[PDB]
Design a protein around this nucleic acid. Structure first.
Lengths: 144, 136, 175
RNA sequence: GGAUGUGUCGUCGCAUAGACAGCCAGGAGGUUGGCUUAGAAGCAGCCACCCUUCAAAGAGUGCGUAAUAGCUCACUGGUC
């Protein structure tokens, strides 16, 4: 209908086909096409499969869309790396698990243009720092 | 609140407050300014007030205590035939005497929980911090 | 510190802001009066184990630890001070505030760092090398552990006038 | 109970290393943190505040949205 651009940061499930709560008219109310995102986003979830990969969408006008599909915050393949499916109630009164430092090389090698750090120690210590609110204790530290 | 068993009855008088004008049990402490009386509910008030504010749960020291029986005659009789039945109970708080001590919370929590406390009382009041060191 | 007067009549001061006074050497005892300002300053600086000097308006510097303070219960300011002029080698039974050190593991599971004795009556280091405070690590304590006067530390050459089993700083449960 | 009324004493802090305020720009990536939830993603309630870099930037404070997004500050630098 119109031409008034938009910069929309969102978040969407991987291999499904979103119902009413997420999208619908959540980014299509400016002006975009849905037919080639139900069949164009659910096909690259045949790449990385089963984790909440983040999505960003920029909208021009008419029926135009240009999206980017980032890196899944492995709060899915780490919750499993313990024993609980739904995360800890309170990270300091009830815990989850204890990942190895080598399961900190799949969050520090999938996030190459995300964890805007230079070194490996930094890019590990980042989401290892995330690995504290999840309610998890680190099999790491000095020495060992 | 109320007590257990006793004498029954009373009277009244004033002139400054004995002890204990010192900050024990806590880091922060609220102190009366007027020769009041204080009632069971008047203090249970501040109990429930501050105990709202501190959440779970602080550490709260009610340094005062109702021991005084105050009466009122049955409403509508001409005097004589008796002394009034025991209406309510009273702590005879005199000035400089300290009513509330708390800690296990910060300075802001003392200021505020004491503010809300003192907005429930017949007295102007001052809150402060320790140093009264004759005996801890 | 420094005074000027020592009579029985206090109109030389008071309004002019000085504190009623005594200080005894134990063979030498003297009444006097010392300006409020300085006394408050130093006494919160140095307190009940402070030790400080008395250069009377005459010229006779003295060695003074602070012994007893007595204050206007209403206005809540001090009006009088008892001193103890220190001797030499043997002193007295110093009163010293227990503190707490480190982020304790006792406050991570809902508990609280409660000092069941804010102040400690020890015995004698020597009246020139006195502990001002104390340092009781609390980290090892969980919820339900107390610290008796045995577990309390020492700096060497000192003894504890307090029963070695009564409770100083103990963690309390939540709510 | 409330008040930058107006005089007096005193505490505390801040800056000749650029201050309180005026205007200028970031106010960041993990991270919708986890819990909770019809959805809470800074912000309805329950335990916790960890890192990436930096001239600086804190699971942040308000208005907000059913929830988003979005607007201001805590700090940071130019100015005076």
């Amino acid at each position: 209908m119109r031409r008034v651009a938009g910069i929309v940061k969102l978040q969407l499930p991987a291999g499904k086909a979103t119902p009413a709560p997420p999208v619908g008219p959540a980014l299509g109310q400016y002006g975009a096409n849905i037919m080639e995102f139900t069949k164009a986003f659910n096909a690259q979830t045949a790449d990385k499969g089963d984790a909440i990969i983040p999505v960003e969408i920029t909208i021009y006008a008419d029926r135009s869309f240009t999206f980017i599909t980032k890196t899944p915050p492995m709060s899915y393949l780490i919750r499993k790396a313990a024993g609980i499916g739904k995360g800890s109630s309170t990270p300091n009164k009830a815990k989850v698990g204890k990942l190895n430092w080598d399961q900190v090389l799949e969050i520090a090698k999938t996030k190459m243009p995300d964890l805007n750090a230079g070194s490996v120690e930094a890019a590990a210590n980042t989401v290892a720092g995330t690995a504290r609110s999840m309610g998890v204790t680190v099999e790491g530290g000095p020495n060992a | 609140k109320r007590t257990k068993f006793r004498k029954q009855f009373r009277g009244r008088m004033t002139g400054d407050a004995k002890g204990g004008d010192y900050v024990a049990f806590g880091d922060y402490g609220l102190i009366a300014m007027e020769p009041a009386w204080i009632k069971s509910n008047q203090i249970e008030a501040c109990r429930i007030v501050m105990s709202r504010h501190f959440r779970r749960g602080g550490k709260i020291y009610i340094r005062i205590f109702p021991d005084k029986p105050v009466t009122k005659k049955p409403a509508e009789t001409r005097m004589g035939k008796g002394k009034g039945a025991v209406e309510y109970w009273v702590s005879v708080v005199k000035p400089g005497r300290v009513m509330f001590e708390v800690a296990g919370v910060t300075e802001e929590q003392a200021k505020e929980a004491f503010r809300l406390a003192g907005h429930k009382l017949p007295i102007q009041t001052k809150m402060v911090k320790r140093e009264v060191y004759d005996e801890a | 510190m420094e005074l000027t007067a020592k009579p029985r009549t206090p109109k030389q001061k008071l309004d002019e802001s000085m504190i009623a006074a005594v200080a005894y050497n134990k063979e030498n005892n003297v009444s006097f009066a010392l300006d409020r300002k300085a006394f408050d300053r130093a006494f919160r600086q140095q307190s009940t184990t402070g030790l400080f000097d008395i250069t009377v308006e005459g010229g006779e510097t003295f060695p003074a630890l602070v012994k007893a303070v007595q204050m206007d219960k209403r206005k809540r300011a001090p009006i009088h001070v008892d001193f103890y002029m220190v001797t030499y080698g043997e002193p007295v039974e110093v009163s010293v505030p227990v503190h707490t050190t480190g982020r304790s593991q006792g406050e991570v599971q809902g508990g609280l760092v409660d000092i069941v004795v804010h102040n400690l009556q020890i015995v004698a280091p020597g009246p020139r090398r006195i502990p001002q405070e104390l340092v009781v690590d609390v980290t090892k304590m969980n919820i339900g552990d107390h610290i008796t006067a045995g577990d309390i530390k020492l700096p060497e050459g000192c003894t504890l006038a307090a029963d070695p089993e009564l409770t100083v700083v103990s963690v309390l449960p939540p709510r």
